[model samples]
Target: SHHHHHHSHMFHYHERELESEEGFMGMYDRWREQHNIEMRSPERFNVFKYNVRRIHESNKMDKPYKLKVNEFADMTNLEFVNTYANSKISHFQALRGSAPGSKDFIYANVTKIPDKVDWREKNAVTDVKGQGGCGSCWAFAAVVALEGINAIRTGKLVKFSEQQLVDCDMTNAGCDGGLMEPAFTYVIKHGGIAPEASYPYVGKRETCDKAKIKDVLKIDGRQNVPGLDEEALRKAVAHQPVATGIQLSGHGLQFYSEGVYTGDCGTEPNHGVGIVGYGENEKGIKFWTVKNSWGPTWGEKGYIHLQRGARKEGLCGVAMHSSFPIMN
Candidate 1:
């Protein structure tokens, strides 16, 4: 047996124009009348009115966006950026494969480890201090990934400075933005990165200081996974624990909100995050758990499940690591 539900659940709320609408203002008056409360302050009235309007709008749109929770339904096509692996092999392989014993190749080879690194109990937290609306997501990803790896490698959960990378890493575009690969390249060349304690994260554009640089870790170049296939991605993740890159989508990612967005908002590619962890959902969906930087209120408690076999459109190619390791 089969059935289909037909409904248009598109809800668009224009915050600025709501008060100007005739019936909308009338409802506000009605509510005030009923509740015996004075609509004294415009701010108070707007807040209350907005919540009520949201309730109605949410109800109006819920049915159309309702995803079937049946046992056999597929959930892979949900519109969300669940992973963020930025390292690509094409660049590294081409560079390394050309000169096996070269300084760069030798350095990269010395850093590769076959064993799994423990990241749990490391207390890795998300940084949402805001990039000042800059396109420095690649920088953020590099620092975060290296932070986890460094912690695991040295058993020290010391914070690395993103501000230093922004200033010193010539390869990185800074406020103009750049890739995680070049960032790593700069780290290897310069020796290493500084701890956040030495240069605490201010989450703003700051000048760089080479003297602030501290403990050095081996820098491995970007490693690419073939196509957008999940198996390849999983294999890459298993090989390299952390990665980063940009996503191509139309809308800006806003937290603590709900809606079914399908429009082409025509937004630029900003920084997003992805983590490769081992796990599966109840429906046999094999995936690597990705943690986003948009705070803890985003999805699934600040994390999203990326299908191991599914390749997101703009997220296929990722930059692996950036910044330096903080050793205890």
Candidate 2:
């Protein structure tokens, strides 16, 4: 009877492990309610269950920084990547470059600037905007910078149409993936883009009405921030929100919750974001205030702080392809 008892004890231990693995019932309830997720079908439940396991794994992983997988709630690693990351080099991206007769790029380089700046507080930066299911972060970033610049110039904030770019900017693919430079080029060529309320987002709209291309706002041209020169970024951002490019990936960026992102960011940039300002904490934890397009639910309320002054190729080449538009 000694052998029988040993087998029974081991089996019970194994059962407990399984039970704990599937013991995310309470968490599931909170996830659905917080994210407003609906289990409309059995398939949806399966997906949610699978994601719960992923969420559990994300929480258990022994990593640095506050990896709040709970913030993502019902999202899987694959699902998050698939949905938010569309900043890639596609054939459409390849088609974009300095247009013929484009003016030579010029910008004021501030050698001695303040230690910290936050344009969002100045009422120049608008509320963080989500890209929806569309891979139109490029559009959102482009318009965000424009909105800030326009606000600073006119003393009025106006949220413009990223959807207009999605439908009308034939230079870049709508939601599949595109380049910011080309999107800027499209806006310059088309005169201007209208407000979002007039040309609201539709995720992946099949067609865009060209007649709706309103010339309410326009740019003289785009100017490049001194190539990866950290000081230039500091100077330009002090003046206006700088549209920046970054290498969006999973190594250390996917589960990013808060604090300065000192993750495994490389030079292979596939995403675009806007840099509102930069500053340091009371303890001297310097950071850049970044505005992302994944919605207000992700990151620090649709924003993140990257460890500032890391220099060139710093934090996923954030200072690499930095640029902004000059209003006409």
What are the models' TM-scores?
0.56, 0.80
Q: CA shift at 129, candidate 1, in angstroms?
A: 5.8
lDDT of 2: 0.69
Off by over 4 Å in 1: 1-130, 216-222, 248-269, 312-328
How would you encode candidate 2's per-residue C-alpha lDDT over 218-252 as one tens digit per residue? 88777767656676678888888988777667624
Q: Each candidate: how many clashes?
A: 16, 1
- Candidate 2 residue spans exceeding 4 A from truth: 1-19, 40-64, 71-73, 89-105
Q: Could you give candidate 1's per-residue lDDT for residues 186-252 as a string of tens digits?
A: 7667777777677665545677775666664545544333333334344444433455443423112
The CA lDDT of each predicted structure is: 0.45, 0.69
Backbone clash pairs for candidate 2 read 87-270
Identify the candidate with maximal TM-score: 2
